Amino acid sequence: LPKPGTYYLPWEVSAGQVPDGSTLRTFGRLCLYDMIQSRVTLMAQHGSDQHQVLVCTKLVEPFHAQVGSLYIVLGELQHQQDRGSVVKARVLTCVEGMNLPLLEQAIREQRLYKQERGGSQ
């Protein structure tokens, strides 16, 4: 059995605020599909800032690509020497039309409740 997948907004993982080898699930919008090297570069906006996450895909071929669309990625993170941070994909589904603010508020509320229950112990 594997470890569970905790949610993480793109900008935190972009800054490397998670330990190496952790399992995380995040979101973003695809920007490029490097065919030969099996690499995916998705992007997510934050005000005037744009953040990039590198996704290895060696475990989900065959895989259709939808340029300029949202995605959900779940897997493990490995801190490479030069490439930086890349997530090893285990499941990679596509969702469209789902509004970000509801999701962001949802994880914020869940984190708040978890911390509140953590105040008794």
Partner: peptide
């Protein structure tokens, strides 16, 4: 040990 957690054939 996690061989069932990946799609068959990969």
């Amino acid at each position: 040990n996690q061989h069932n957690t990946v799609k068959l054939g990969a």
